[PDB]
């Protein structure tokens, strides 16, 4: 709803819009553009790729990378609006993109 | 009242024995008997040297020595050409599996042997009438882009120039001939020159190649700059002292058909053969061993698998140059549950090597290895090298297509006795987690084993073997409680390398 | 038949051509045995796999 | 220095007992006693026949 | 240890970690005022699995 | 700076620099294609070039 209502206005002024957040697969990318987005922004999807910083660690029998919101306490420390978590390894974006 | 601290070292002599157990006492079952790696520890000693000083030179067979005691297992989910190449580069060796046609296996061996060269035998060449399109197809196929140009397009032809990747790299017209794009003036070495002499000329030119030619100007051989780079980057590489080619191992069965298979592997440049069996003490395998020593006398033969003194004696008498130890100790194996037949790996390694080492027959500790600790203990009990299957499965050099399940990146890993592999099973099919490249993993194991030797107080694996047998190195049993305490314990959560 | 075939291979690995021979070689001390510590039993079975899947 | 491989079978006679335990020694509790199937293994021997021959 | 006893003679020195009689004798001879015992017994430690080296704490 | 057509202010080295210096520069930047200028400044008089091949086996 956010992408549609904003772009329906923004497109009238020739202002392209980025659909940021909630993207996890190719289908989300398609639907975001369908609703008016010009590009899509990806965070979690690209986290855990080799080109992403910084180092991998192993937990629960899975190869993981740390993934946290800029609004998390950890990030702001160099009221939280984000959390700290982990994401699975995905390999190089030279294949993923 | 208390003794003076100055008398501390002198007071040690009042004790009948050193603290802990000798290897003899540890394996003197008894009471207790039938133990494996996790059932005991090696006690620390005296440190008077850095871990970087620790030498890990190890005998694979009577005539083959490695810079590291690491051997990749002959399984279709662990060791193909890529695996064997990098194991050799990193100071170990790979045993190529035989779950494939004889031709396919020979090709894998050949790729391992041709990965690094000193004087390249029969280098790939191109004729002057070939097109850029042909050269690009050749690059994709081998695939390398440095080809000397001969008149007949044969390796023995008259050299007329050279074509490199830079030459074809930005050519738009693919129909152009090699003769048009090639470099005509090429520095060459004269036939009869030795490798050290040839290498210097190559180093002086700063060119990709150094073709070797006879007085008539016909190509006889070639050097490559990358071979020098490979030597520089991998100084511990397992290689032939003469050809500079990486050492390569391969597995075979002991049926009559494997005779033709082995002949093809030898033609591909095989250095060591492993007779692959869960129970190697058979008339079938004994006959195969005898046949090999008289047919291929220069080929080193590793027999097995064995777990008893009697098995070892039988195959050593047959002429085995090395032994493979393990029955049921495999991660993906089930021989003990299906055959009621096998042995705890620790006890197996000790009792076999205690006999085999007297004959200078090195033994491979095969199966049940999962960490650096297992490697140290296997060698402590008498093994000369360790074979790894599951530990190396899931690495990038491993032959597999990575798949995702349960939120984990996995590779399939299966026992060679599994119905899937053979197509009564003695193995099963499973999966293992991603581990990345062994270019990082093997040096970690190497470095880890160095630190382990340091803590024990030995400067080499040769010294390690001597100090254990003399009763200088000491051991201790691990009760089930001690093993839990020894590992990670009492944490809500936890997360070695990288 | 799987159990039958399996028992045949088991006898083979042990080196006996029959159950009658098997009985004799055990009682004479020719057939040999080994204890299994709890660690050896885990090692003897399937171990250290993320997942795994005998007959058919 | 190392013994000649040809003496491997002969050298076995220098040992007081065969490798592993007899059934008597296994079940000579002791120390240890009260064991079941999963507590032990049968050690492999010498193969000179096909499994199909097993009666 | 030797350097500390001659430089800071009033400073008490605890040496380790050790798990054997021989280790203890060595550091006591060196002048240790106390010993720290344990190798691999730690909750968050893995020396025994990585070095094959340690001892049951008891 | 990852991809260029005309490289602005390319990294350079002086003739009095050592092979040790060049290798330290290779690890830092990290390329090995340094033109050589007399004053060691990017705007200096070109007197040659040093590449990876030049220092690989020194
Ligand atoms: N070019 C070439 N390389 C070979 C041949 N046989 C084996 N090799 C190996 O392949 C490597 C060549 O790599 P490199 O020279 O960088 O590739 P190129 O420059 O495109 O030929 C060397 O390490 C050789 O040992 C051959 O017939 N031709
Ligand atoms: N003059 C001369 N040119 C050569 C020689 N060897 C190769 N070249 C040419 O120099 C260029 C670079 O070759 P090289 O560095 O060997 O190729 P690379 O291995 O792809 O980097 C190519 O155009 C080659 O044809 C030689 O001995 N003399
Ligand atoms: N051309 C070539 N030369 C080699 C290779 N491996 C070793 N050499 C040469 O063998 C000679 C002795 O070098 P060496 O001390 O063995 O180097 P290391 O193998 O890194 O220890 C040197 O001339 C090396 O350049 C190879 O694969 N190709
Ligand atoms: N030196 C240099 N030239 C480039 C680079 N990218 C493109 N060019 C040149 O720009 C010209 C046309 O490029 P084109 O194929 O249209 O792709 P584009 O330049 O990436 O838009 C060609 O002559 C290229 O060689 C670069 O990164 N470096
Ligand atoms: N050599 C060099 N390359 C640079 C510099 N700044 C950016 N680059 C880029 O880094 C890359 C280095 O080229 P490359 O052949 O990979 O390494 P080199 O041959 O060791 O210099 C090129 O794409 C350059 O455009 C610089 O100051 N020197
Ligand atoms: N409010 C808030 N938004 C965040 C925080 N961190 C990241 N974001 C947003 O969440 C997006 C990530 O979406 P994802 O790709 O993980 O679904 C980012 O592009 C960014 O816009 C945070 O700490 N607080
Ligand atoms: N009995 C039996 N042993 C196997 C089979 N596949 C592999 N092995 C053994 O198990 C070892 C690998 O063990 P891992 O390193 O996974 O613990 C190999 O070296 C090999 O001897 C099989 O199908 N049956
Ligand atoms: K611990
Ligand atoms: K097993």
Numbering used by the authors:
A (entry chain A): 348 to 425, 446 to 464
B (entry chain B): 2 to 424, 446 to 517, 520 to 522
C (entry chain B): 465 to 517, 520 to 522
D (entry chain B): 2 to 56
E (entry chain B): 290 to 347
F (entry chain A): 115 to 172
Publication text:
The enzyme IMP dehydrogenase (IMPDH, EC 1.1.1.205) catalyses the oxidative reaction of IMP to xanthosine 5′-monophosphate (XMP), which is subsequently converted to guanosine-5′-monophosphate (GMP) in a reaction catalysed by the enzyme GMP synthase. The reaction catalysed by the IMPDH represents the rate-limiting step in guanine nucleotide biosynthesis and hence IMPDH is an essential enzyme that controls the cellular pool of guanine nucleotides, playing crucial roles in functions such as the immune response or cell proliferation. IMPDH forms tetramers in solution, each monomer consisting of a catalytic and a regulatory domain. The regulatory part, ∼120 amino acids long, is inserted within a loop of the catalytic domain and is composed of two repeats of the cystathionine β-synthase (CBS) domain, constituting a CBS pair or Bateman domain8.
We were also able to solve the structure of full-length AgIMPDH, co-crystallized with GDP at 2.25 Å resolution. The crystal belongs to the space group P4 with four monomers in the asymmetric unit (AU), each of them located around a quaternary symmetry axis that generates a tetramer. The electron density for the Bateman domain of each of the four monomers in the AU was clearly visible, including three GDP molecules (see below) and the linker regions that connect the Bateman to the catalytic domain. Surprisingly, although it was not added to the crystallization drop, unequivocal electron density for GMP within the active site was observed. GMP is most probably the product of GDP hydrolysis with time in the crystallization conditions. Thus, AgIMPDH octamers are observed within the crystal lattice, assembled as dimers of tetramers that pile up tail-to-tail. The dimers of the tetramers of AgIMPDH are mainly stabilized by an interface that involves the Bateman domains from the upper and the lower tetramers, which associate to form an antiparallel arrangement that buries a surface of ∼8.800 Å2 per monomer. Interestingly, the β-phosphate of a GDP molecule contacts the side chain of Arg167 in the adjacent Bateman domain, further stabilizing the interface. A direct consequence of the interaction of the Bateman domains is that it brings the finger domains of the monomers from both tetramers into contact and arranges them into four pseudo-β-barrels that further associate around the fourfold axis, contributing to the stabilization of the interface by burying a surface of ∼5,000 Å2 per monomer. In our structure, we found three GDP molecules bound per Bateman domain: two of them (GDP1 and GDP2) were bound to the canonical nucleotide-binding sites of archetypical CBS motifs, whereas the third one (GDP3) was bound to a previously undescribed site.
